[PDB]
């Protein structure tokens, strides 16, 4: 008789299959009766909970692709397909199903087994030509918008997409598909055309991996064209017809290359998504469904797949971003037809269809300028080239181009101060020094050179009133292990008055908890650092923005949380003392630029805190275009930030009301103040309800800008003011000298200096 | 320069055999780099010169020293 887990399988998917198709038939009730049923009723998920021998079976079943049904055990995925035919692990089987009110009765031939309805596991039940066609078709049925069984998608598609794109660049595709097709229609064949096809598939095969290999499209077509020319009068041509077609659509994909496909297939697929969900949005779901209803009043099934599709838009939508994203992995000079679709894409007008628009712009600009690892190759050139490479080692003017770079260069430069040429080593490394402590005053810096494996730099500076003098140390290293065995010379050659930052490699990974926890427990295992006359500060810098690991304790707590991922001299300028009347917890967060703190009003022992505000504080330097770009990046950051602040609610809740945004714009745009005021108006206006759900009421920016007539960069701390209601007040000031001063209209709370701590209710 | 490790190993013994069974004479340009600014090309080039001098005798140990900073030392032992 049967096997239990097969039992669960054929159970789950029999009830499912019946219910899923029935749900369709229930839709067909509603559609003949003109009834606007809620999408959900089409019932992909079917939740079967079936207790055999005490262990409950917890399940969902989601139809995943027209062939394919997925049985989901507590969020597991096992995929079978049907038509009753069943396909399982071994082979094809025959099952019969008797259903009852409260018992589930499965007969598998002459055998019966019975289960009553009254944990954590997955089943392992598991060439380029079929991997391609198969995977592509499966994803386009997924991605027309059917729905999704589990979380794994955001991973699954990523792998899937690389197999596609990768096997699509692989110029052995036309060969594998023209082998396989022209072999499977080998008969019915005219040998002129067969000796032509079989020769030329064979020496596409021989000539693949040539530098100048293109498909001989025109050649095959022309041969077909001439003997079609002489078979034209004849009209005995329907064998010839199905070979001249079977050949013509395959050859028709392949004239413009592998990017013949990357244009065609994805662009079309894009408009497929686009068209569907653009017709979908014109007002609100109900009314829009009545206009959809009435454009094709008689039937709603194509529409229903549409409706079904926009239930999970974000799944589609994110992955659409993926597709464009790796397209832009190879965009830079694309085309009119595409840019045309892009200007079509920017107009998209709904909260759900909010990624694609930002993607449209981000693509259109990054198109105009590369900002990823390829231009990290370009900086390899700029940096190493810019070095002077002698005892001179003078590139101070270039250092100011680093400091007046539209592009932010705290990102990639750290990757280079550990290359392999000792003079340029030295140059690059000290420019890194200069760019770290440019805020305080450096009066002496000596390059050190120890044993063989360590490059040491020295700092010499003093305190401008942060909270007399001190030196510093930089070291460039390959693995943390070596760092802890080369330990003994760093403190070998070292009131602690030394700053110590150590650069390490190994590009930290999933285990952030045990990762830095281990790092801290390096300090508590060896306070030997403390025994060597104490160290003021230990920052571990792990490269890739390099992840900083701040350990502040000459005599203090081991590890510093507010400033993780950041260096406190340059970080202080985020005026973080303006909330000292608060209790703030540094939460590690994506968009790591954006450090968000949750604030409880700091009060004296006599009293208990009254305020509970969400603070989100960012830093801004992501590389006419810049200003609009600034806005766009702000929007992107806002959506991620609201994802993060959502995590912040889940993690800890206090129901904040007058949320704060702190923005430090470190670029230097050229613009006017009042079109800036309309632009930010357009932004804030553009986003409506979402603002009110989080009820974000306060935003602060600063931004150094300049005017090329003066070419002189001024700071303008713009502070944003909006309260309950969508009524919005924009506060613009001026910064005036010695403690900087907000000076304007008439605005309430007109004139105050800048380090104004935040009013506590 | 391509051959040399430019880690501390700087183990080009096979390439050294191309140097020592070179139809081409390599006393021409090799001098131009054994005083280049590059500690690796210093070390390598200089001791291969040694070896190309004393090919007649038997060399049983050769260690580079590196002192105060501005001096590159090779040691002969034979």
From Swiss-Prot, chain A:
One Gene Ontology MF term: identical protein binding
Keywords assigned by UniProt, alphabetized: Acetylation, Allosteric enzyme, ATP-binding, Biotin, Cytoplasm, Fatty acid biosynthesis, Fatty acid metabolism, Ligase, Lipid biosynthesis, Lipid metabolism, Magnesium, Manganese, Metal-binding, Multifunctional enzyme, Nucleotide-binding, Phosphoprotein
Modified residues (Phosphoserine): 122
Gene Ontology, cellular component aspect: actin cytoskeleton; cytosol; fibrillar center; mitochondrion
TM annotation in the entry: none
Cellular location(s): Cytoplasm, Cytosol
GO process annotations (BP): acetyl-CoA metabolic process; cellular response to prostaglandin E stimulus; fatty acid biosynthetic process; fatty-acyl-CoA biosynthetic process; lipid homeostasis; malonyl-CoA biosynthetic process; protein homotetramerization; tissue homeostasis
Post-translational modification: The biotin cofactor is covalently attached to the central biotinyl-binding domain and is required for the catalytic activity.
Tissue/organ expression: Expressed in brain, placenta, skeletal muscle, renal, pancreatic and adipose tissues; expressed at low level in pulmonary tissue; not detected in the liver.
Disease entry from the Swiss-Prot or TrEMBL record: Acetyl-CoA carboxylase-alpha deficiency: An autosomal recessive inborn error of de novo fatty acid synthesis associated with severe brain damage, persistent myopathy and poor growth.
Free-text comment about domains: Consists of an N-terminal biotin carboxylation/carboxylase (BC) domain that catalyzes the ATP-dependent transient carboxylation of the biotin covalently attached to the central biotinyl-binding/biotin carboxyl carrier (BCC) domain. The C-terminal carboxyl transferase (CT) domain catalyzes the transfer of the carboxyl group from carboxylated biotin to acetyl-CoA to produce malonyl-CoA.
Subunit structure: Monomer, homodimer, and homotetramer. Can form filamentous polymers. Interacts in its inactive phosphorylated form with the BRCT domains of BRCA1 which prevents ACACA dephosphorylation and inhibits lipid synthesis. Interacts with MID1IP1; interaction with MID1IP1 promotes oligomerization and increases its activity.
Described purpose of this protein according to its UniProt entry: Cytosolic enzyme that catalyzes the carboxylation of acetyl-CoA to malonyl-CoA, the first and rate-limiting step of de novo fatty acid biosynthesis. This is a 2 steps reaction starting with the ATP-dependent carboxylation of the biotin carried by the biotin carboxyl carrier (BCC) domain followed by the transfer of the carboxyl group from carboxylated biotin to acetyl-CoA.
UniProt name for this protein: Acetyl-CoA carboxylase 1
Lineage: Eukaryota, Metazoa, Chordata, Craniata, Vertebrata
The gene coding this protein: ACACA
Residues of the full protein shown: 625 to 1580 of 2346
UniProtKB/Swiss-Prot annotation, chain B:
PTM note: The biotin cofactor is covalently attached to the central biotinyl-binding domain and is required for the catalytic activity.
Signal peptide: none
Domain of life assignment: Eukaryota
Bridged cysteine pairs (disulfide): none
Tissue expression: Expressed in brain, placenta, skeletal muscle, renal, pancreatic and adipose tissues; expressed at low level in pulmonary tissue; not detected in the liver.
Subcellular location: Cytoplasm, Cytosol
Disorder named in the UniProt entry: Acetyl-CoA carboxylase-alpha deficiency: An autosomal recessive inborn error of de novo fatty acid synthesis associated with severe brain damage, persistent myopathy and poor growth.
Subunit organization: Monomer, homodimer, and homotetramer. Can form filamentous polymers. Interacts in its inactive phosphorylated form with the BRCT domains of BRCA1 which prevents ACACA dephosphorylation and inhibits lipid synthesis. Interacts with MID1IP1; interaction with MID1IP1 promotes oligomerization and increases its activity.
Main function: Cytosolic enzyme that catalyzes the carboxylation of acetyl-CoA to malonyl-CoA, the first and rate-limiting step of de novo fatty acid biosynthesis. This is a 2 steps reaction starting with the ATP-dependent carboxylation of the biotin carried by the biotin carboxyl carrier (BCC) domain followed by the transfer of the carboxyl group from carboxylated biotin to acetyl-CoA.
Domain notes per entry: Consists of an N-terminal biotin carboxylation/carboxylase (BC) domain that catalyzes the ATP-dependent transient carboxylation of the biotin covalently attached to the central biotinyl-binding/biotin carboxyl carrier (BCC) domain. The C-terminal carboxyl transferase (CT) domain catalyzes the transfer of the carboxyl group from carboxylated biotin to acetyl-CoA to produce malonyl-CoA.
Name this protein carries in UniProt: Acetyl-CoA carboxylase 1
Organism: Homo sapiens (Human)
